[PDB]
Amino acid sequence: NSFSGYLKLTDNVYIKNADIVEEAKKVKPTVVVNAANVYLKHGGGVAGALNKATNNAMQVESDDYIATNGPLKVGGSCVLSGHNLAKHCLHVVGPNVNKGEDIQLLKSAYENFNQHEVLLAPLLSAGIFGADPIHSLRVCVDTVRTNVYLAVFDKNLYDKLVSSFL
Ligand SMILES: O=C(O)C1=C(c2ccc3ncsc3c2)CCC1
């Protein structure tokens, strides 16, 4: 949990312009959050990047989880191994608003972070999920009460978030 170069947004939310995969390799946090889907198929975005950094070990493990437990629900989560990136990976499903999934579920997705004291995480429902990233940061700030270190890869997006926030 040796986080460096973050800007403190609120008492418990920090932000950095960084690749979450590289942050995970440097820090080796207790928990890294994955922006997952209900079947834990890590095909792109943060999910594909995190899976790729474990050389597909996260996917093989996720397939076994789904066969034994069934899919997650939108707004839900599960804890699996963090492999070489972290002690644990908290897979969290935010709503895919481009597929008509309710934005009210973005609050439920962020509530999952509260079961862990410190997390390294991406913004939820950003990218292909289609939610407004600045709105996603507002829900995170209103909902998360534990210590969250947000990593945002795209510098144009990071700059828009920091500008809107401070
Ligand atoms: O820039 C980001 O914060 C965002 C994404 C992303 C995509 C690929 C990727 N590979 C390594 S870190 C990473 C983040 C998807 C949407 C938001």
CATH of the domain at 37: 3.40.220.10
Distance from Cα 33 to the centre of ligand 1, integer Å: 13
**71 DSSP 8-state letter:** P
Choice from 154, 155, 162 to test ligand 1 binding pocket (greatest atom count within 8 A of CB): 154
Cβ 30 vs Cβ 87: under 8 Å: yes
At residue 24's C-alpha, the angle toward residues 163 and 147, to 5°, is 55
Tell the residue number behind the tokens 């947004």, with chain if given: 9
Task: Tell me the β-bridge partners of 33.
Answer: 90
If one counts the domains in the chain, the total is: 1
Q: Cβ(130) to ligand 1 under 6 A?
A: no
Q: Is the dihedral of CA 125, 137, 47, 64 positive or negative?
A: negative
CA 91 – CA 97 distance, rounded (Å): 18
Which among 47, 35, 1 is positioned nearest to 149, based on CA atoms? 1
CA 20 – CA 132 distance, rounded (Å): 19
Which among 10, 21, 35, 4 is positioned nearest to 123, based on CA atoms? 35
CA 62 – CA 93 distance, rounded (Å): 14
130 CA to centre of own chain: 15
- Method used to determine the 3D structure: X-ray
Tokens of 118: 């410190």
Provide the domain limits for residue 59: 1-165
Distance from Cα 136 to the centre of ligand 1, integer Å: 14
Q: Is the dihedral of CA 81, 84, 86, 92 positive or negative?
A: negative
Q: Do β-strands 77-81 and 88-93 pair in parallel, antiparallel, or remain unpaired?
A: antiparallel
Distance from Cα 76 to the centre of ligand 1, integer Å: 21
Distance from Cα 45 to the centre of ligand 1, integer Å: 5
Task: Tell me the β-bridge partners of 150.
Answer: 15, 121
Q: Cβ(20) to ligand 1 under 6 A?
A: yes
Other beta carbons within 10 angstroms of residue 108's beta carbon come to 20
Q: Cβ(139) to ligand 1 under 6 A?
A: no
Strands (E), the chain: 7-8, 13-17, 31-36, 77-81, 88-93, 118-121, 147-152
